[PDB]
Amino acid sequence: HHHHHHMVHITLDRNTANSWLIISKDRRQVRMGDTHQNVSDNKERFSNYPMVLGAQRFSSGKMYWEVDVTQKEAWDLGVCRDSVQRKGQFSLSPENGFWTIWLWQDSYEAGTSPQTTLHIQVPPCQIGIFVDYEAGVVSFYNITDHGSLIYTFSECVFAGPLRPFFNVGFNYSGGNAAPLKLCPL
Numbered sequence: 001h002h003h004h005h006h007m008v009h010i011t012l013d014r015n016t017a018n019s020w021l022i023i024s025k026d027r028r029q030v031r032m033g034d035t036h037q038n039v040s041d042n043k044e045r046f047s048n049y050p051m052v053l054g055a056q057r058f059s060s061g062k063m064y065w066e067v068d069v070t071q072k073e074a075w076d077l078g079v080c081r082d083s084v085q086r087k088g089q090f091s092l093s094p095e096n097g098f099w100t101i102w103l104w105q106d107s108y109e110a111g112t113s114p115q116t117t118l119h120i121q122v123p124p125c126q127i128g129i130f131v132d133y134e135a136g137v138v139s140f141y142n143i144t145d146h147g148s149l150i151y152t153f154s155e156c157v158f159a160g161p162l163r164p165f166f167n168v169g170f171n172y173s174g175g176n177a178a179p180l181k182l183c184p185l
């Protein structure tokens with residue numbers, strides 16, 4: 001891919017974060033805390049999962065960013081509609097306004113309904129996310145493996161402004177404490 005030149009500076013929106021997340025001062029890193037982080041509740045916060053949105057809203061153009069997933073056992077990444085449900089249980093699917101991939105129990109899957117098996121030979125330490133709003137495309141790249149394609153959602157029906165989407169995952173195992181980090185351009 002030659003998508004690097006649509007690079008955008010993404011920062012995390014504290015106000016959308018699950019109340020257990022800790023976002024760094026620079027708003028470029030997020031990790032799961034071992035307790036409630038002493039913030040008030042609001043209608044923006046993801047209640048059931050360790051999720052947070054980027055501050056940026058996209059309704060046009062081409063956008064690229066990279067996320068560091070080093071030493072994590074579980075995570076979700078991609079984009080979602082600004083109007084996605086925040087409270088209660090839900091599945092990550094394009095019908096619900098999400099265009100995502102994830103790692104769970106040693107397998108990588110795309111958030112289709114039902115989910116799609118991914119074929120990755122080189123476990124990624126960094127993921128590139130490309131969005132072409134007009135084309136209706138969301139693509140994922142393996143930065144660790146020379147930028148190799150992981151998955152392309154095509155014919156996407158965004159149906160509104162898009163926000164960068166992150167899930168740091170639970171840490172029941174004690175092996176998933178590491179942060180998601182937005183990588184420098």
Ligand SMILES: Cc1nccn1Cc1cccc(C#N)c1
Pocket residue numbers: 018019020021032047048049050051
């Ligand atoms: C109340 C509770 N029972 C089990 C675990 N937790 C903490 C929790 C719940 C939902 C999302 C997050 C995050 N992020 C943390």
